[PDB]
Amino acid sequence: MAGNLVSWACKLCRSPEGFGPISFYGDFTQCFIDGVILNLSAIFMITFGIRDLVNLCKKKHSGIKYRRNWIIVSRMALVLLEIAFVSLASLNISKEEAENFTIVSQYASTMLSLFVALALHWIEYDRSVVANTVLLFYWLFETFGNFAKLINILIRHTYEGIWYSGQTGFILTLFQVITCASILLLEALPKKPLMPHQHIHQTLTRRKPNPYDSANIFSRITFSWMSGLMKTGYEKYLVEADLYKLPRNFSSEELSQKLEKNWENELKQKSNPSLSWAICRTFGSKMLLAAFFKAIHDVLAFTQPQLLRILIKFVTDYNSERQDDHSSLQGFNHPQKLPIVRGFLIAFAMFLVGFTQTSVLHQYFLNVFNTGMYIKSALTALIYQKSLVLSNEASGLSSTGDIVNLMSVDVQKLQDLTQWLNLIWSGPFQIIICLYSLYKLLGNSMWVGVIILVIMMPLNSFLMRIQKKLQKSQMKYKDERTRVISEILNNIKSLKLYAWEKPYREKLEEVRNNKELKNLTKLGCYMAVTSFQFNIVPFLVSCCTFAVFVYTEDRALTTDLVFPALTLFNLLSFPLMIIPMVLNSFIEASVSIGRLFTFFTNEELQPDSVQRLPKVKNIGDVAINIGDDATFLWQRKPEYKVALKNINFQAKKGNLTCIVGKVGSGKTALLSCMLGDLFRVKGFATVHGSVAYVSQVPWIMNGTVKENILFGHRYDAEFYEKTIKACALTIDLAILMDGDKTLVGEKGISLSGGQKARLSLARAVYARADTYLLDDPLAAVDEHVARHLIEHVLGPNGLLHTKTKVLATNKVSALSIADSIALLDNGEITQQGTYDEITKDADSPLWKLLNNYGKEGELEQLQKLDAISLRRASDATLGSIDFGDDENIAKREHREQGKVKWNIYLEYAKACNPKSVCVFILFIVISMFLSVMGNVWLKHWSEVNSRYGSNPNAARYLAIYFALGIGSALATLIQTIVLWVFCTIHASKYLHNLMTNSVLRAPMTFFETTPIGRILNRFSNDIYKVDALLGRTFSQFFVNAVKVTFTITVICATTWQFIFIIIPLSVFYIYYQQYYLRTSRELRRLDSITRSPIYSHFQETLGGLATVRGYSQQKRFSHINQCRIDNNMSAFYPSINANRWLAYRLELIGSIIILGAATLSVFRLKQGTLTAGMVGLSLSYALQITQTLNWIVRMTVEVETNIVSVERIKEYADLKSEAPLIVEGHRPPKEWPSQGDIKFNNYSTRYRPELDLVLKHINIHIKPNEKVGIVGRTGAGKSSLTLALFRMIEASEGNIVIDNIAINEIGLYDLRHKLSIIPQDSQVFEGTVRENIDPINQYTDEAIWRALELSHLKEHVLSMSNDGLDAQLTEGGGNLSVGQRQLLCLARAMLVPSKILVLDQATAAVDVETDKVVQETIRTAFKDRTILTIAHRLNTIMDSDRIIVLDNGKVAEFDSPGQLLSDNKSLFYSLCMEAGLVNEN
């Protein structure tokens, strides 16, 4: 059948070169250029030209005129010029050349095509926004086609000495190349001009439009539209407003509606619906396009080793013929020698393959990640929309955390599947190509290498498993250390007061240095083994394959069988290793689809549960009618739980209808029926007008108080103030610091229940709804406040007198004013009627509940304070949400000077042993150098085989080659062991010890000002990053950096002229690296912060589904969810394309390196010095450089993100410590305090330098062993006297003398240790009872038991567990009562052998019985100690022998209790009169 075609092809082409694709000279033949490339591009231009022409003529003119400029006349001029040259070329055809059908058909088709192009340029300029894709590809293909025609003509002239179309044909084709190139540049480069008219509307847009929509096809391929964003993010920090809008197809509303339409189509039109089929039906097209580009990428990827094989064969045969003919120049026709130009065009073919592979690869990634974003947006919005209509049976079925995790986890899993979906076929497809390539290259010996890779797969999996086990144990010890630090920080006050810093620091170091770092050493060793395995296996595949080849095959192991084999094995390594990841992704995704499908199929609310209708007009009209013996069920499956039975409820406009009964008696169910939450099995139900609703639990959004009251309604100053006054919220609003601007709920200030209920009701009144459904709002409200609410809101004289009101409450006050009552017992309404009817019908129980109940500043404050038909509220325009990050902008005050803080890197290098860092870098060089010399020996081995034509001394060459591979592998083993054992672990031990010693030594002002959570975060997260992650990133960076440096010097050694290529590419590489570093880091930050509000909002919605469904604000809440999805995706879209912007440039740079190495090598072949080994070795290394450039840029980003952890750690390490703990010469005697003589010498102090004085000129002198009471008003600084005594805050003026030695000269340890304390903040450390009494183990157990006996704590300690002192205590002392903690603090205090005690009870009022026993123990046991008593209540002070009166930091009165009471005008007496003690006295 095909025999006719073979003969028919001979008739078309008459040139002796033939129709074949590649000529003898390595270029496209004349018949192939004219017959195929130019004809196909002409047919392409014709069929797609007229396609676009009819489309652009059918399409309506948009009205946006583009100004006719020098662009359009230049394009039309050059296209006319091109038509002229094609005409002249047609005339230049000779008589013999007319015989070729191909060339005449080429000029005919090109001439016809140019008229279509001439028209389409005009239509494109007039109407099309972007430069038309068809024109750009047409001029690209004809630039290529005419350039190939030029090179063909020039090669035939140079080698054969005849112009194949005359000099005229050469000159015309030269001008056609120049004309086509200039038309391509004028089409692609210049920006489209615009008329001045339409620019007035550019101020309406909020954000700039996406440049992707305006990007022509070359810009889309090269991703050059990202370049402007990269320059912006390099130059400054990216604010949210800088990010462009999403492209037109990415809106969450459009995607969700598309997937919703497909999904409900599956539900309706199939008996076995599947969510997966719906997804793959609606987003399946671009995945097919991605698969097509992946197939092209695989073919082009595996073309490169074959071109390398061709080139090495060419260089071998070129040198062979030079040596053969030069050695036989003695003789006198020789065949046509190999042309050197064939080498250059092979070198250029490698560039074209690398460039095309780069382009299709990133178009594959573009379509893949775009599909991932589409599936994420569509599923997220569908999940939210399904949440609003979940039946309460379904809502109670599943927990809130699981439903949020559907959005947060499962959708993220399906997004990740889209990345790896194409590898199910591309993996086998790449493997099948590679095995076929290797089989033809090496024969049967390939299978030994494949067996080794397959065998080493489970070994890799086993190492990953045990690595995961070690990582989990590392995380467990991290949590252990974090919890210990948390207890230390939370109880830092007691820790400093008792001088317990040393034992708890020793406890922390025992955990750290004994368990965590020991486990980290094990992790380091196993990572070293993993690195050794990853380094030896790529060698061992090639070494074993060549070993088996040489003995079994008689063929010579030449270079072409070796370096292409190494490249092919390297390409084989990746796809054979990703398959376990792909399969794991599929299983995880299959689980996620199961979760989502089960979620979407949950039972939804019955829409017809109630007929909701427009409002009723007249007062007294029936706004609610439930009747006909209506029956409603809580659940339809599995249990038919009848919620309500025989309901006949009816309510009228303006009247207050009350539902009364026990909890669960049906009252909350009947309100749920009005909302339509319950399923209606029988009866009819109606509700008229807008509904406002209040849940029994007051649900509050986490926004502002004003946002909670408005709740999407427009602002109105009069009603906003009026409702605040009506709800008695003004006093509560005034007490709040920022008033209505205060944040609310979980993130903001927590509100008390009665205050919370008032805010919830205030929302309802502001809506001005037609019907009010109130599920017991007065339960958490005080009586007098409730009366105020009954007067102004609910009463007939209130705001809502004209509105319908339903109030399910049982309080007597509400029932008295209520119009009609309904009695509801256990889901059955017994009887209803007006309140007057029941009053005379006293025999019924409704009167009885009133009977048995029976019978000023707060009431006055509550009571401190026509308009026919209050018009309803207006819902405000939804508009658009913009994320708020103003605090973050304040943090980034630098505005991206962005120069690297090299002081951090040097400080970290000094944290590691700097000598060990040099050793670590040394073994990287030794590793790579041996690996490079391993290939050099392989080059020498292959050359010897090629020269001999056999395999002489196979054992000798193979043994030496094996030795160098093991040498390189052992160097990586020693590299990673030195990394973890010596460098990384030493730095982690050094940094953590430096930080803990500094933080524990820091003064109290540091702990007070800084949040405790922030300090704990730096102890946990930053140390974890330094231990596990920071060492990893440096090792990956230096290994790849040294790898590229050895790759460069190998190529330069083979061809010294390559230096001139590296320098321009080096500056471009650094130029792209810096732009990616700043921009991609900032885009990831924006992406991260924008993720969380979507989940927090959805969790917030789930709490208040009843409220949202009550007010019918579903559309508003749905819109808010859609807007927050787009805000996150607006940051995610440029973040992803940042990678493809970078990866295109680096692969382009890598492709140019391959061109430079190949072409300069062939230039060296003309000199005659080149050998087959040199081009094989240098060019083989050049192919691998593209991956290493990607690693270096990526690891630099990882280094910068993690190195800030070292900066934060050093920030706390540099904290200025307080006064020294010990002064060597000034240490007091062991007996000190000998007596307890306290003397103050004009003492004065401030809490902080910036704060005013809190003590002034204190001259207090305390006799030994006197009971001193401290009395003072709030804010007098009475509590500051405690801190002054222990030097917790330094003395601004004066000094304190305890037993004729000033404590200022005494170290803080000697001061704080020798004094007994019962602090205000009673605190319990996590640990044993023994740990909380004597962590230093200074005292015997008998003394401890005596202390527990005196504290009345001995029996309770024995009761907790049989072990006694070893009994554990929970974190924070949760197991112990608050009063018990006071006794425990008392147990600590009495055990200290010192003669001075200070007792602080400035706020201790929890319980009196624990106070009484504490008091009696103080009087009895502590007789010999000088006691200072700081007490809130004066009753504890009246028995004191001496009393200090502190007022405004001065010594107001220092008198006995009798003198104070005798002086009725004293400050102490007046304070007692305020407390009422004077009345008793």
CA distance 883 to 1097: 13
Cα maximum dimension of the chain: 143
Judged on CB neighbours under 10 Å (0-12, 13-18, 19+), 1174 is buried
Residue from 999, 1039, 941 nearest 558 by CA: 941
**935: helix, strand or coil:** helix
DSSP state of 720: H
Contact of 367 with 287, CB cutoff 8 Å: yes
1186 found inside a domain: no
Q: Which structure tokens are listed for 1338?
A: 């200074």
Which single residue is written with the structure tokens 């299983």? 587
Judged on CB neighbours under 10 Å (0-12, 13-18, 19+), 1334 is buried
On the CB side of 932, CA atoms within 13 Å amount to: 20
Q: Which structure tokens are listed for 607?
A: 């829409």
Q: Which structure tokens are listed for 1405?
A: 């009022």
* Cβ neighbours around 617 below 10 Å, total: 9
Reduced 3-state DSSP string for 433-444? HHHHHHHHHHHH
**666 labelled binding-site residue:** yes
Instruction: Give the C-alpha distances (Å, rounded to integers) separating 1149 from 354, 356, 1135.
Output: 10, 13, 22
Instruction: Give the C-alpha distances (Å, rounded to integers) separating 13 from 20, 108, 150, 160.
Output: 10, 16, 19, 20
**1275 labelled binding-site residue:** yes
**524 labelled binding-site residue:** no
Residue from 835, 836, 766, 775 nearest 803 by CA: 766
Q: Which regions of 820-961 does DSSP assign to beta strands (E)?
A: 820-825, 828-834
Contact of 173 with 150, CB cutoff 8 Å: yes
**1276 labelled binding-site residue:** yes
Instruction: Give the strand pairing for 1238-1246 and 1261-1262.
Output: antiparallel
DSSP state of 98: G
**1426 labelled binding-site residue:** no
Contact of 1101 with 1117, CB cutoff 8 Å: yes
Q: Which residue segment(s) compose the domain that 755 sits in? A: 607-842
Per DSSP, the residues of 167-207 read HHHHHHHHHHHHHHHHHHHHHHSSPPP--SGGGGGGGS-SS
**572: helix, strand or coil:** helix
**632: helix, strand or coil:** strand
Which single residue is written with the structure tokens 């599923």? 379
What are the start-end ranges of the H helices in 59-204?
A: 70-91, 101-127, 133-160, 166-188
Helical packing angle, 1059-1103 and 1031-1054, nearest 10°: 150
Which single residue is written with the structure tokens 């920071």? 1030
Q: Reported resolution in A?
A: 3.2
Per DSSP, the residues of 1373-1419 read G-SS-HHHHHHHHHHHHHHS--SEEEEEESS--S-SHHHHHHHHHHH
Adjacent-strand bridge partners of 1142: none
Q: Which structure tokens are listed for 687?
A: 């509700």
Contacts of residue 1267, Cβ cutoff 8 Å, sequence gap at least 6: 1427, 1429, 1439, 1440, 1441, 1442
CA distance 555 to 950: 7
133 found inside a domain: yes
Instruction: Give the strand pairing for 1293-1298 and 1238-1246.
Output: antiparallel
Which single residue is written with the structure tokens 């732009």? 1075
Reduced 3-state DSSP string for 989-1011? HHHHHHHHHHHHHCCHHHHHHCC
CA distance 1452 to 1443: 11
Which single residue is written with the structure tokens 């018949």? 31
Instruction: Give the strand pairing for 1450-1455 and 1238-1246.
Output: unpaired
Instruction: Give the strand pairing for 771-774 and 1327-1328.
Output: unpaired
705 found inside a domain: yes
Residue from 167, 74, 153, 149 nearest 107 by CA: 149
CA distance 465 to 529: 14
**661 labelled binding-site residue:** yes
The CATH number for 640's domain is 3.40.50.300
**665 labelled binding-site residue:** yes
CA distance 1026 to 1213: 15
Residue from 1455, 1453, 1014, 1029 nearest 1272 by CA: 1453
What phi-psi label fits residue 610: left (phi over 0), alpha (psi between -120 and 50 degrees) or beta?
Answer: beta
Number of structural domains, the chain? 2
**712: helix, strand or coil:** coil
The length of the chain in residues reads 1481
Q: What are phi and psi of 1289, to 5 degrees?
A: -130, 130
Q: In the listed set 141, 175, 194, which residue is the last one of a domain according to the structure? A: 194
List residues in the chain that are followed by a break over 2.5 Å (C to N): 332, 855, 865
Residue from 821, 828, 875, 827 nearest 850 by CA: 821
**79: helix, strand or coil:** helix
**400 labelled binding-site residue:** no
Q: Which structure tokens are listed for 1180?
A: 């083989």
CA distance 75 to 136: 12
Adjacent-strand bridge partners of 682: 631
* Helix/strand/coil percentages in the chain, nearest 5: 65, 10, 25
Q: What are phi and psi of 656, to 5 degrees?
A: -95, 110
The amino acid occupying position 1081 is R
Instruction: Give the C-alpha distances (Å, rounded to integers) separating 882 from 206, 243, 359, 1129, 1225.
Output: 11, 12, 36, 13, 64
Contacts of residue 278, Cβ cutoff 8 Å, sequence gap at least 6: 259, 262, 263, 265, 266
**1104 labelled binding-site residue:** no
**667 labelled binding-site residue:** yes
1228 found inside a domain: no
**What would you report as the CA-atom Rg of the chain, rounded to the nearest whole angstrom?**
43
Burial 1103-1120 (b: 16+ CB within 10 A, else e): bbbbbbbbbebeebbbbb
Residue from 488, 477, 481 nearest 1012 by CA: 488
Contact of 1269 with 1437, CB cutoff 8 Å: yes
On the CB side of 1360, CA atoms within 13 Å amount to: 19
The method of structure determination was cryo-EM
Burial 339-369 (b: 16+ CB within 10 A, else e): bbbbbbbbbbbbbbbbebbbbbbbbbbbbbb
292 found inside a domain: no
Contact of 645 with 683, CB cutoff 8 Å: no
Which single residue is written with the structure tokens 């003590």? 1255
Q: In the listed set 842, 877, 904, which residue is the last one of a domain according to the structure? A: 842
Contacts of residue 1056, Cβ cutoff 8 Å, sequence gap at least 6: none
560 found inside a domain: no
What are the start-end ranges of the H helices in 776-811?
A: 783-789
CA distance 1177 to 940: 10
Contacts of residue 1391, Cβ cutoff 8 Å, sequence gap at least 6: 1333, 1334, 1339, 1343, 1344, 1347
**989 labelled binding-site residue:** no
Burial 1197-1223 (b: 16+ CB within 10 A, else e): bbbbbbbebbebbbebbeeeebeebee
71 found inside a domain: yes
Adjacent-strand bridge partners of 657: 806, 820
1391 found inside a domain: no
The amino acid occupying position 1213 is A
CA distance 1046 to 1064: 19
Helical packing angle, 1114-1167 and 226-235, nearest 10°: 100
Q: In the listed set 842, 877, 895, which residue is the last one of a domain according to the structure? A: 842
Q: What are phi and psi of 743, to 5 degrees?
A: -75, 160
Burial 1007-1027 (b: 16+ CB within 10 A, else e): beeeeeeebbebbbebbbbbb
* Cβ neighbours around 1431 below 10 Å, total: 20
CA distance 722 to 793: 11
**1276: helix, strand or coil:** coil
